[PDB]
Amino acid sequence: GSMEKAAVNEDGLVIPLIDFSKFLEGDETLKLETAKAILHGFQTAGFIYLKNIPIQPDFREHVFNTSAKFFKLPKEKKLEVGWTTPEANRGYSAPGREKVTQLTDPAEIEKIRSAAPDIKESYEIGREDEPGHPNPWPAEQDDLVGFKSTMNNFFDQCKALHIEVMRAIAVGMGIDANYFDSFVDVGDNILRLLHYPAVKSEVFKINPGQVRAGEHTDYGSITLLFQDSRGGLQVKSPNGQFIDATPIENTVVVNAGDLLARWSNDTIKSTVHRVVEPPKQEDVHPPRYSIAYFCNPNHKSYIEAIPGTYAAESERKYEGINSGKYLVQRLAATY
Ligand SMILES: O=C(O)CCC(=O)C(=O)O
Numbered sequence: 001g002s003m004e005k006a007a008v009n010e011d012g013l014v015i016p017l018i019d020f021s022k023f024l025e026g027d028e029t030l031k032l033e034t035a036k037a038i039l040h041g042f043q044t045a046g047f048i049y050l051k052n053i054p055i056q057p058d059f060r061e062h063v064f065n066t067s068a069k070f071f072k073l074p075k076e077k078k079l080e081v082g083w084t085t086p087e088a089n090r091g092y093s094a095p096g097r098e099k100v101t102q103l104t105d106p107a108e109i110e111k112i113r114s115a116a117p118d119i120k121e122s123y124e125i126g127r128e129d130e131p132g133h134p135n136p137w138p139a140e141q142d143d144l145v146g147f148k149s150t151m152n153n154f155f156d157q158c159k160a161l162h163i164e165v166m167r168a169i170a171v172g173m174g175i176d177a178n179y180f181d182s183f184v185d186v187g188d189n190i191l192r193l194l195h196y197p198a199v200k201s202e203v204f205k206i207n208p209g210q211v212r213a214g215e216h217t218d219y220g221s222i223t224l225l226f227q228d229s230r231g232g233l234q235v236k237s238p239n240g241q242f243i244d245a246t247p248i249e250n251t252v253v254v255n256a257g258d259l260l261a262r263w264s265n266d267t268i269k270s271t272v273h274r275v276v277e278p279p280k281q282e283d284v285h286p287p288r289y290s291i292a293y294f295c296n297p298n299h300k301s302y303i304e305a306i307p308g309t310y311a312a313e314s315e316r317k318y319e320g321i322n323s324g325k326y327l328v329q330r331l332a333a334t335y
């Protein structure tokens with residue numbers, strides 16, 4: 001059974017490239033081989049690349065064009081649909097500079113003045129019918145006619161891919177193929193549209209420590225990351241070095257989040273990643289677009305060690321937790 005050349009292979013970090021159609025359409029042997037490859041990727045790197053996913057490239061291109069049209073809106077129109085609370089986790093955001101005030105501790109004043117916020121903006125969409133948390137959609141005029149219908153369609157197709165990736169994980173683990181279905185079928189996911197504005201490379205010298213997206217781990221089960229061809233995404237290697245996650249045409253980068261790491265009793269890795277300058281020399285870095293679809297267990301789900309991820313009970317590292325509660329704690333922490 002032919003395995004593809006790794007998407008990334010540097011400094012001990014090996015991120016496999018996997019043809020997802022072989023899990024969905026292959027005979028039983030090929031299906032299992034592919035599922036095991038997916039699982040092995042999550043167990044080692046915490047990251048995989050998938051090609052030939054059910055989401056069509058022309059639709060993805062349209063979704064990116066539609067996203068670009070949103071971010072071209074004037075600042076006042078974007079702020080009108082602003083991110084409000086961590087428990088909603090929906091709407092427009094752009095990181096601002098912290099201000100010095102009467103209340104600030106003088107030890108922190110030097111840091112605040114020299115701090116460089118991430119050069120990015122985002123717009124987050126949740127499932128439409130979540131009680132108490134409506135999506136703040138912008139008005140549908142001119143270029144934004146079709147915005148909602150496009151993004152809701154994309155949301156549901158990514159929701160479907162989440163279910164299938166978890167099925168691959170289950171098949172790879174040798175547990176019931178549909179084990180995760182009842183934990184993920186609600187689609188309590190977040191569609192994060194990202195725009196990193198064009199920026200002069202000198203900005204990164206004027207502001208040392210400046211990045212496009214600060215280093216972090218994702219919170220949920222998995223993240224489906226669709227990136228354009230600009231580059232800048234980096235994944236931390238097992239030797240502690242950030243390695244370039246090179247863009248590959250018509251792939252989706254998939255990584256496990258902290259909840260899946262915990263759920264798997266740390267058999268699956270949630271790996272630190274960031275976005276920095278693209279690895280090419282140029283005076284001006286053009287705009288970068290990406291879409292992060294954060295997949296989560298159902299907010300009602302109780303998360304405890306998956307069967308087959310431990311032998312003796314003493315090997316369980318974590319107490320059970322409610323999924324929804326965990327996420328809001330992560331979202332609310334910074335504020
Ligand atoms: O833009 C990217 O490629 C990464 C975005 C990301 O890691 C995130 O939004 O959590």
Ligand SMILES: Cc1c[nH]c(=O)[nH]c1=O
Nearest residue numbers: 089190217218219220294
């Ligand atoms: C990084 C991150 C931000 N917002 C979310 O909802 N989930 C995540 O994993």
Ligand code: NI
Nearest residue numbers: 216217218273
């Ligand atoms: Ni991330």
